[PDB]
């Protein structure tokens, strides 16, 4: 059946406002005249793609029996000279002459661009034609554009398209409402908690919920395609009625899908777990606590009346786990994640760089909550004064763009910026002030217990000889780093593989699992060529930075 | 029979199942989809490298499925008159919808659908908005599914990449060894083969080849076989004897010849001029030769062993020593002998005058390296681009620092890191940044010392391997007399 | 600032026209070290685009008579990179210096920041202020 | 010819290419020679205008798409091949790249014999010395 008003969710105030604007001045014209007002000429709708605009238009078309007249934006043009203006004029004339109708203009930006900074001439003619006609009762026009700033400002004025309605992304309750709306005509079996699914679904807006539902359903359909050996010759009967979507289907779909807004910046899945990051226990605990509180129970902060810090900087020597911690956060934080590499955004053209910075930060704010990991800040946020070289002033301009989009951050949207550099000396002192990256985490060289935990975390998924004492490796190893331990285990693995290949070749030669696990001798031989990655001067510099 | 079927494409099974699902299941068992209320996806976007097989998939769907099929080439829709492009799109969609449940295919959608924000030509933005409305809107679509193909999906307007318009994005990516085996079996199913041919070795030795590359390989092999017998019988236009027309038999040697000529199409631009050198040309330094060959040949020949332990291989090496010890010679030997692809890079080659193009160049080279993996990347004179991050205040706005940061992130960052082997060669290892010499970037620091007496003797024997000599000549004296000499002297 | 040619100065131009229209107004220019960059610092440039922006600003700020009574607020962290041509008196004269808070100022700041804070009744911020001496307001 | 296809009018370059290929295929087993392809086949990412991107996409679709070709061969000439769209440098579109490089001594002698077959030479002129002393001559 036709989409009724119940079919929309996640927008209470906006839908109520649209109902007030569209129904009352059309269902009761006499009462408005008695009060002494008149209906507005038009109403604009804007917002991110896939939010419910077109849904709202069809719901208004269905609920009210008033005559309707659709004119899609790019459908007003014509090859014949000036027949486009005549078409639009005849559209409005028919809409008025027939009845107190309602007109919905979809994608107006295609036929309502800023009159200045244009090249064609028919576009100006149609813009002026619509401007003068709709500038001249009991009929209202609804415009729905995905990008509101590409409109001729002459239309954004009293008397013509005066009432705007910010159709935004939903909240948790609205998203749950949408989930309920879509799941009404579906077999949910008996084990499902949509409240948890909405609390975990963070950035999705409107249609993305439908995508989630469809994907979960598809997974369920896949489960019963071959497990029952479904006959492709003709349809089975009893299996069709035994279809029920489980929780695992929805979790599987959620683990695959991503918000449409972040679809461009999707990062390839790299598996890491919180037990994989050996050592640094307090750092992981503090990071989890600081990142989880604003999203899990902000009411405590509201009672406290103080907003949380939304930035953090990892600094320390190379090969300690900064990128490892960031990757683990990307994997197991239950929030969106945008990874950027230092000189990724810069471009030769003038301004494009800052355009990229604004686009990325806009994407971060849109799919809130989000965690943008800026790795190697010594490229985009180096010392402003230190950069004496005048590459045309681009570096200062990008630094200022980053400051304006990082310091101009409201309490809403909870965007957490993680910085990570191995040289803390190069970052501009403006950055390292509270309000942008207040917290400063230092990742020191591992200690004996930390080193043992790191080792156990590295070769956890590696069969090894049972009588092996990792504590020995940790002992007599003082200045090493996690990367060095990785090098040691990789050397041991290489020696084991070499022994395996030699034994297999010998076995094949004789013929025509010798080494199921790594022997202690492999580890003994791997340690002959192990050296510290970081010298003492670097440690001196980092200690000086810490003490300063 | 000649028409491509689903059996005529291989190397990608998951994506094949996904596309078969979307195109067939709502048109073969609709009641099953009527059972649960939710409707199936009705829009799919295929994206991937250029010669991966996207258009082949579209052709297979068109040939196999019994539903109506309508074809839209990318620039084909647009026309000169002012209001004709949108009229063409509307007419196309109306034709597809009116006739039957149908599949539209939009080939090279990147030409029709720009970002709608960076573009400046009006007609483009009106055609994009017309597409947006036609594909989704009031009375969106009855029983018509839309397939699009592109090579750069990031150049598409985000409004198209939303559910309802393009619901699922399938990635037709580079095959694997089993994929290359399947492709080879597909393309050699009708040609005439000699019994000696062994396709498994060919699939193993082809590294980074994607789709059409395999076809090129077989075609070249055939061409060589034709150029082996055309010398026997020639310019007999009226007729060719049946003894040579039959019993052609493309030998395995032909395939080896064609494999030696060709290279992965992705690396077409960055091919290195063939400088043939063998392992016997490198005298002395046997242990370094063994370590290098073991460190390169094990991950590419014995993947099962690494998985059995579940530990990643080391993927770095740095040669350092006095000039002329044999670093570049070792790199040349690796380039000529090892089966993996070779990327030869000079020191300052990657720098550029403009702002940001140096790091763009680095990203492109590493993108090619990660595309045709397993690959070897040789950074000659690594001290040229990777210098200590001293700030470079009296420099080109610290462009060297950004280059070093780009290299750092590219060799170890948010990447899958499948198989890229970086080889460094510097005669000044003190100027290299300490943040690259740690393990995980360049794991093995190999010192190439000055040759000893037996190493000088080995070098002398190696360098005279193709020269006629005096019978009584004893090179042992020359070795005994040179104490501090190097290979170059 | 914009990539295309001419458009940049047009954007500064329409914003200042809008400012002139809705007089009185307060145009807040944050981070002038990006707009008012040291004139012609080095020959190496994008294309005198920073210089064109500065000239557009100079011609559009000198045409401020008594009428329309507009007021431009600047705010920078690094005052060393501000062009002297725009800091000249009669163009942009007033120079307020905002120093770091002192102990009494820090206590006032803390009391203003803890207005909407259900603090424990048996708590006083005077100790923190007396101890925290070189602590900025952000601290 | 290379830039022979470009038109001021919007959506006409591809019309010219389509008409050309249709004419080539409608007649007989034909050959299409496209001279100086670097002017109508750039990298599609360094360019900014839309008409070049669109013409390149039309060319790519023409050379390899549904209903690809039927006994027609495309030949191309270029002075710098690295500045060509990678999507064109693959089997099916441009199967093999022939390298027409500088001749060696024998090649130079062959060229000299070719170019001096219509002149009235003296008896005292030999070409072997001439082919020897000429080193970097491209023919």
């Amino acid at each position: 059946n036709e989409v009724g008003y119940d079919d929309i969710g996640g927008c209470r105030k906006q839908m109520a406002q649209i109902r007030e604007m569209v129904e009352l001045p059309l269902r009761h014209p006499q009462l408005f005249k008695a009060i002494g007002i008149k209906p507005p000429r038009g109403v604009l709708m804007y917002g991110p793609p896939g939010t419910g605009k077109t849904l709202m238009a069809r719901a208004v078309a269905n609920e009210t029996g008033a005559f309707f007249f659709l004119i899609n934006g790019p459908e007003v043009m014509s090859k014949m000279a000036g027949e486009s203006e005549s078409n639009l004029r005849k559209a409005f004339e028919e809409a008025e002459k027939n009845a107190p109708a309602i007109i919905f203009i979809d994608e107006i930006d295609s036929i309502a661009p800023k009159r200045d900074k244009t090249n064609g001439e028919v576009e100006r003619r149609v813009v002026s034609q619509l401007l003068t006609l709709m500038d001249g009762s009991n009929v209202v026009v609804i415009a729905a554009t995905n990008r509101p700033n590409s409109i001729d400002p002459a239309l954004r004025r009293f008397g013509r398209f005066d009432r705007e309605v910010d159709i935004g992304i939903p909240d948790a309750t609205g998203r749950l409402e949408v989930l309920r709306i879509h799941t009404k005509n579906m077999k949910l079996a008996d084990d499902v908690d949509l409240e948890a699914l909405a609390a975990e679904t963070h950035g999705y807006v409107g249609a993305d919920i439908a995508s989630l539902c469809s994907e979960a359903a598809m997974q369920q359909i896949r489960e019963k395609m071959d497990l029952i050996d479904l006959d492709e010759d003709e349809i089975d009967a009893e299996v069709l009625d035994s279809l029920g979507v489980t929780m695992d289907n929805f979790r599987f779909a959620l683990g695959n899908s991503n918000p449409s807004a972040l679809r461009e910046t999707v990062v390839e899945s790299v598996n890491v777990t919180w037990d994989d990051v050996g050592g640094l226990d307090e750092i992981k605990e503090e990071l989890k606590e600081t990142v989880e509180y604003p999203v899990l129970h902000p009411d405590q902060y509201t009672k406290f009346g103080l907003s949380p810090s939304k930035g953090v900087l990892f600094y320390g020597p190379p090969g300690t786990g900064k990128t490892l911690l960031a990757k683990a956060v990307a994997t197991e934080v239950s929030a969106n994640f945008i990874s950027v590499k230092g000189p990724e955004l810069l471009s030769m053209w003038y301004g494009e760089s800052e355009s990229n910075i604004r686009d990325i930060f806009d994407k971060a704010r849109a799919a809130a909550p989000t965690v943008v990991f800026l790795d190697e800040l010594d490229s985009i946020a180096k010392a402003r004064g230190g950069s004496l070289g005048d590459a045309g002033g681009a570096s200062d301009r990008v630094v200022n763009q980053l400051l304006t989009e990082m310091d101009g951050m409201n309490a809403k949207k909870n965007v957490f910026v993680i910085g990570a550099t191995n040289r803390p000396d190069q970052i501009d002192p403006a950055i390292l002030r509270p309000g942008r990256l207040d917290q400063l985490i230092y990742v020191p060289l591992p200690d004996e217990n930390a080193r043992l935990s790191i080792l156990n975390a590295q070769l956890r998924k590696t069969p090894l000889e049972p009588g092996l004492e990792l504590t020995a490796i940790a002992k007599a190893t003082q200045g090493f780093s996690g990367a060095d331990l990785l090098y040691i285990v990789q050397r041991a693995a290489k020696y084991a593989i070499k022994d395996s290949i030699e034994a297999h070749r010998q076995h094949e030669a004789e013929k025509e699992d010798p080494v199921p696990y790594i022997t202690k001798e492999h580890f003994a031989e791997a340690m002959k060529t192990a050296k510290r990655s970081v010298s003492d001067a670097e440690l001196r510099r980092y200690e000086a930075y810490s003490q300063q | 029979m000649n028409e491509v079927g689903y059996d005529d494409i291989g190397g990608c099974r998951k994506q094949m199942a996904q596309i078969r699902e979307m195109v067939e299941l709502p048109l073969r068992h609709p009641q099953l989809f009527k059972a649960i209320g939710i409707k199936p996806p009705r829009g799919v976007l295929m994206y991937g490298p250029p010669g991966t097989g996207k258009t082949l998939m579209a052709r297979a769907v068109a040939n196999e499925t019994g539903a109506f099929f309508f074809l839209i080439n990318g620039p084909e829709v647009m026309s000169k008159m002012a209001g004709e492009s949108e009229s063409n799109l509307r007419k196309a969609f109306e034709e597809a919808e009116k006739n039957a449940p149908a599949i539209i295919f939009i080939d090279e959608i990147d030409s029709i659908a720009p970002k709608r924000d960076k573009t400046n030509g009006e007609v483009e933005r009106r055609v994009v908005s017309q597409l947006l409305t036609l594909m989704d809107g009031m009375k969106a679509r009855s029983n018509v599914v839309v397939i699009a193909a592109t090579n750069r999906p990031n150049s598409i307007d985000p409004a198209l990449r939303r559910f309802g318009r393009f619901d699922r994005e399938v990635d037709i990516g580079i095959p694997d060894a089993t994929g290359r085996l399947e492709v080879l079996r597909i393309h050699t199913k009708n040609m005439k083969l000699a019994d000696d041919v062994d396709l498994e070795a060919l699939a193993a030795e082809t590294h980074g080849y994607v789709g059409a590359d395999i076809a090129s390989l077989c075609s070249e092999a055939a061409m060589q076989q034709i150029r082996e017998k055309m010398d026997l019988i020639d310019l007999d236009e009226d007729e060719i004897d049946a003894e040579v027309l039959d019993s052609l038999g493309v030998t395995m040697d032909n395939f080896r010849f064609a494999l030696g000529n060709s290279n992965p199409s992705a690396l077409r631009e960055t091919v290195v001029e063939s400088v043939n050198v063998t392992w016997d040309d490198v005298g002395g330094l046997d242990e370094i030769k063994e370590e290098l060959k073991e460190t390169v040949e094990y991950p590419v020949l014995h993947p099962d062993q690494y998985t059995k332990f579940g530990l990643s291989p080391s993927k770095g090496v740095l040669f350092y020593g006095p000039p002329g010890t044999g670093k570049t010679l070792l790199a040349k030997a690796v380039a000529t002998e090892v089966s993996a692809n070779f990327i030869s890079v000079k020191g300052p080659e990657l720098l550029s005058m403009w702002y940001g193009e140096s790091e763009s160049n680095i990203r492109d080279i590493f993108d090619k390296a990660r595309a045709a993996a397993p690959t070897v990347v040789f950074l000659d004179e690594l001290d040229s681009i990777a210098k200590a991050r001293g700030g470079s205040l009296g420099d080109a706005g610290g462009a060297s620092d950004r280059v070093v940061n780009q290299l750092l992130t590219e060799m170890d960052g948010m990447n899958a890191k499948k198989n890229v082997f970086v080889i460094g060669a510097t005669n000044r290892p003190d100027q290299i940044d300490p943040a690259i010499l740690r393990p995980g970037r360049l794991d093995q620091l190999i010192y190439v010392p000055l040759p000893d007496e037996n190493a000088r003797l080995s070098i002398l024997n190696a360098q005279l391997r193709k020269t006629p000599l005096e019978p009584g000549l004893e090179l042992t004296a020359i070795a005994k007399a040179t104490q501090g000499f190097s290979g170059a002297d | 600032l914009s990539m295309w040619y001419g458009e940049s100065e047009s954007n500064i131009r329409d914003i200042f026209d809008k400012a002139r229209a809705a007089a009185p107004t307060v145009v807040f220019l944050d981070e002038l070290d990006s707009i008012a960059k040291a004139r012609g610092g080095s020959l190496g440039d994008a294309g005198g685009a920073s210089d064109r922006v500065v000239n557009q600003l100079l011609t559009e700020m000198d045409g401020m008579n008594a009428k329309k009574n507009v007021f431009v607020i600047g705010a920078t962290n690094r005052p060393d990179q501000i062009d002297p041509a725009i800091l000249r008196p009669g163009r942009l004269d007033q120079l307020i210096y905002v120093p770091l808070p002192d102990e009494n100022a820090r206590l006032s700041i803390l009391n203003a920041q803890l207005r909407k804070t259900p603090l424990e009744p048996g708590l006083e911020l005077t100790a923190i202020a007396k101890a925290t001496q070189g602590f900025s307001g952000a601290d | 010819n290379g830039p022979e296809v470009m038109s001021k009018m919007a959506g006409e370059s591809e019309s010219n290419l389509r008409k050309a290929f249709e004419e080539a295929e409608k007649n007989a087993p034909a050959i299409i020679f496209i001279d100086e392809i670097d002017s109508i086949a750039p990298k599609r990412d360094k360019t900014n205008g839309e008409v070049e991107r669109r013409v390149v996409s039309q060319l790519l679709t023409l050379m390899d798409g549904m209903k690809a070709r039927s006994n027609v061969v495309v030949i191309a000439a270029t002075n710098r091949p690295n500045s060509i769209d990678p999507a064109l440098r693959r089997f099916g579109r441009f199967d093999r790249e022939v390298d027409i490089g500088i001749p060696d001594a024998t090649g130079r002698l062959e060229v000299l014999r070719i170019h001096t077959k219509n002149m009235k030479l003296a008896d005292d002129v030999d070409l072997e010395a001439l082919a020897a002393e000429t080193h970097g001559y491209v023919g």
Partner: peptide, 22 residues
């Protein structure tokens, strides 16, 4: 009848220079 013409003229690029400090 009218017609729509396309035009794409140019843009603005940024160069990078090297300096020497005495």
């Amino acid at each position: 009848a009218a017609a729509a013409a396309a035009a794409a003229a140019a843009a603005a690029a940024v160069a990078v220079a090297v300096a020497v400090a005495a």
